[PDB]
Structures are given as C-alpha cells and as structure tokens.
Design an enzyme around this catalytic site. Structure first.
Site: not given
Ligand SMILES: CN(C)Cc1ccc([C@H]2C[C@@H]2C(=O)Nc2nc3ccc(-c4cn[nH]c4)cc3s2)cc1
Ligand SMILES: CN(C)Cc1ccc([C@H]2C[C@@H]2C(=O)Nc2nc3ccc(-c4cn[nH]c4)cc3s2)cc1
Lengths: 243, 246
Positions: B15, B123, B20-21
């Site tokens: 994502i 930041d 990477l995440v």
């Molecule tokens: C649509 N559904 C079925 C799949 C889907 C795919 C992608 C997303 C992205 C919006 C969601 C997202 O990116 N969530 C994230 N949650 C976090 C939590 C912590 C961190 C983080 C904290 N420190 N470094 C990274 C990054 C993210 S991105 C939602 C749903």
C-alpha cells in the site's frame, strides 16, 4: 500525559459503581468515560501514569487526568459497548464461537504486552475488560476476588504473570459461557479447597474441546506449567486456524 | 513490546513505498499495516520502542516488532483510510467544515500529549497522520528522537532549531492542508521564495472552507518567534472553542 481541566468535561450519565464512572465528553468532542476517585490520590494518579505509558491496541487508553477539583478523576476513551461481562450477557445467544475466540485473542494480545512490560495485572476478569468498535476487546485497570486467583496467589500471595494466566483462563470461561458467573453460589473457602483439590470449571457448550484444553493449561496448579501469555497467544491462534 | 514471529504475518498487498508498507494480517486475525525497513536497524527498532511507550487515543499504535528475519518490520494497527494527505485528496469535495476542524483537534490532542512528554515530532504533516474508523485521525512517526521548508518555522529553516514550538508551526501548515482538502502548500513556490515570503511576514491564504476563526488559529501557529506561538496544550482549547461557538 495531559492534564485536563474540569471545565472541559461534560458528565452526561453515570454507568459505574466502585470510584464512580460517567459517560461524558471532553471539549464537547470526544466521547469519554470519566472515573472519579478510599485510596490515596497519589496512588490513583500513579495508576494513570503507568497506563499512559503502555501503548497497545488491546489496552485501554486515557485522554488524561483531571486533578484540579475534588474529587479528582481519570479520563478514558469511551468504549461503545462497555464492560465485557455486561456485553456478554446482553448479547447472549448472538455469539458464534469464532467471535468468542476472537475476544480471548484480543485480551491475550493485551496481556502478552503487559507480561513483556513486567506488569502484573492482579485482577484480570471480564468485568475488567471493555468492548469497543466492532467488538474489539481491551484490557482495563492494568496499572495497580478469589474466583480469579491462582492457587499460589490465594495460598501464598505470590503474584506473577503466571497468576495472571490463571485469571485469563477464568476470563475465557466467562467469555465462552457468554458471561455466566464462575463457581456461582460457592463461598471463597469452598473455591479454595475445591481448586486445591483439583476441581476446575466445566466446559461451556460453545467451547470446543480444543478451547477447553487451553483453559486447562491456564489452570495448571504449578505456575511453571502454565504457558506465558506470549505462548498462549499462539496456542489460541492455532485453534482458530485449524477450524 | 511484543516480539512478532514472521510466520504470524500475512502480506496481502503493498500500500506504500518510501521502507515499504503492506496491508496484512497478524495471526490471520488483526488487520495490520506492516512496515518493512538503507537505514540503521537499531534506529528502526528504537523508533518502535519509543512509540510503544506513548499511549494516547490520537497516536497510532503497534502490535509489536518482527525482528527475526530481514528485512525486519514494524507491525502497526491498520488504519482503514490510510494517509491523511491521500484521504483528503481522494475525497476532496465531500468534507464538511466541521469534519475538517475535528481532524485538526484529533492531531492537536496527540501533539499535546507528545509535547507534555518532551517529544519533538519534527515532521508533522498530513502525510504523517492516519485516518482510522469513523475518520479519527492519529499522528504517526513520532518515535524518532535522533529539507521540507514548506512546513518549517523560521528558526528551523534558519537555525535548524527544533522544539514543540516548531512542531506547532508545522501543525499550522497541517491545518492548512486539512481545510484545503489536501492541496499543496506554497504550490507554485520555490524554497527561496517561501523563505522570503515567510521572512517578510506573509502566510498561506485562508482556504475557502476555513472560517476566519480557524484562520486566526493558523496564524497563532505561524508567529515569527517560537515564544509567541501557543503550546499545543493551549492550542487545543482554542480549537475546541471554535467548534463550540459555531
Ligand atoms: C479496499 N480494501 C478492500 C483494501 C484496502 C487497500 C488499501 C487501503 C489503504 C488506505 C489504507 C491504508 O493505507 N492504511 C494504512 N494504515 C497504516 C497504518 C500505519 C502506517 C505506518 C505507521 N508508520 N509507518 C507506516 C501506515 C499505514 S497505511 C485500504 C483498503
Ligand atoms: C445506545 N448507545 C448508542 C448509547 C450508549 C450509552 C451508554 C453506553 C454504555 C455501555 C457503554 C460504556 O459503558 N462504555 C464505557 N467505556 C468505558 C471506558 C473506560 C472505562 C474505565 C476504565 N477504567 N475504569 C473505567 C469504563 C468504561 S464504560 C453505550 C452506548
């Protein structure tokens, strides 16, 4: 953590006895549960100080502390469904076993964190867990009742994360029984002798044999034979995965 | 915090990039964002360590750390709507002003907590906040105790002097991002232009959706001298009053 001014708290309705608890708001925005403080103020406060430095998704969180005006209070995030014990009762009959297992999983995740932090809860029970959005469960009052007490505890006053594990077993029973009362109508002395004798709580019908197995691991007489929360977590997850 | 075994993580889809995440699950159960780590492992980890001892409802949380196999990773709670900057951009046109103000409150609550703990973020921008269930906003990446002029107070771009007060300047810019629904601050402007404009007392225009009261608070955050900016603790009460007054 943040100091909160009395003026910023709206007390909407009581929902707790002990000190007392109210549903309310902070800054007319965030839904909160407010806990008003016998027991020393410094201890009541230090309890909050401890919890405000323990961050885990399955551990309850505080917005802050309100010390200006007596009685002082703590300000916790509001949990939409309240105490687990109550929730289990009111929702009785609607629970699938997978869901009940999920609940034990949440608590165990919380406790494995506390265990790692060298924090002993001492009073782990469904009544000390909360039910939030989408039925996620959080542990509460983790910054400090014979029916949740291990044998070495009620016998030698010897607490450890292992005594917490015992309590967790009883919490599991509470959950799978949909909120029944453990050793109901048994006196404290009766519980002690019964357990020292080898008696354990019966398997609730919604608990598979696999689930009951784990309960019994938690209820091993010697602390060293009970799994740590960190290992118990993987045992519970394995059951889910095996279907 | 808890150690997490690599076997316990399911990686569903990437994502994000930058480590990477990935969207994933821990124990086939909890929806998680997994952040895989050039940069020091020990620093990567200490960051997690700091974050695991800072508990506030508006600061993002970790399930734990997965150290066993490289590349190592941090395991955060999943936030359904992801990065605040992205969310604002994709849903642009749909936000009510009250919703936008509520988002700034969320962030300010988290920052007040960090402030009290003497944690300096360094930041603070929309892209470093996350949007969960019910559109709650949580601050992220606040664990690093040890470029982007557009979020920089004068004492930062001139002297590299960081403090909660420079965080507050940054927060003001964050507010701008929110009420502008994810627009780029100082979009047509070079770094030197920004330095000049700021140094001569000029500030980001008021977004359409920001009331004059909202804009006032932005401007408190953008006081030239850090000593003239309100602490996050005071900012909070300023923001709440505007929601109250209507
Ligand atoms: C649509 N559904 C079925 C799949 C889907 C795919 C992608 C997303 C992205 C919006 C969601 C997202 O990116 N969530 C994230 N949650 C976090 C939590 C912590 C961190 C983080 C904290 N420190 N470094 C990274 C990054 C993210 S991105 C939602 C749903
Ligand atoms: C009908 N719905 C929409 C409104 C409503 C009203 C009241 C309740 C009460 C069951 C809800 C509840 O009790 N929530 C609670 N949240 C917390 C959070 C923390 C603590 C706490 C932590 N330490 N000590 C107390 C207690 C509660 S009760 C739910 C829903």
């Amino acid at each position: 953590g943040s100091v909160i001014d009395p003026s910023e708290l709206t007390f909407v309705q009581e929902i707790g006895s002990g000190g007392l608890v109210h549903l309310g708001y902070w800054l007319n925005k965030d839904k909160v549960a407010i806990k008003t403080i016998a027991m020393s103020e410094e201890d009541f406060i230090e309890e909050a100080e401890v919890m405000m430095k323990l961050s885990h998704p399955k551990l309850v969180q505080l917005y802050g502390v309100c010390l200006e005006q007596a009685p002082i209070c703590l300000v916790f995030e509001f949990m939409e469904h309240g105490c687990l014990s109550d929730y289990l009762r009111t929702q009785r009959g609607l629970f699938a076993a997978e869901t009940l297992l999920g609940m034990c999983l949440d608590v165990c995740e919380g406790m494995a964190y506390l265990e790692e932090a060298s924090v002993i809860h001492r009073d782990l029970a469904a009544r000390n867990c909360l039910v939030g959005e989408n039925q996620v469960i959080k542990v509460s009052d983790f910054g400090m009742p014979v029916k949740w007490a291990s044998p070495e505890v009620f016998s030698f006053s010897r607490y450890s994360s292992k005594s917490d594990v015992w309590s967790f077993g009883v919490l599991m029973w509470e959950v799978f029984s949909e909120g029944k009362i453990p050793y109901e109508n048994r006196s404290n002395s009766e519980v002690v002798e019964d357990i020292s004798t080898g008696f354990r709580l019966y398997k609730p019908r919604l608990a598979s044999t696999h689930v009951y197995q784990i309960m019994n691991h938690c209820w091993k007489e010697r602390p060293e034979d009970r799994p740590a929360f960190s290992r118990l977590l993987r045992q519970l997850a394995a059951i889910a995965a095996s279907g």
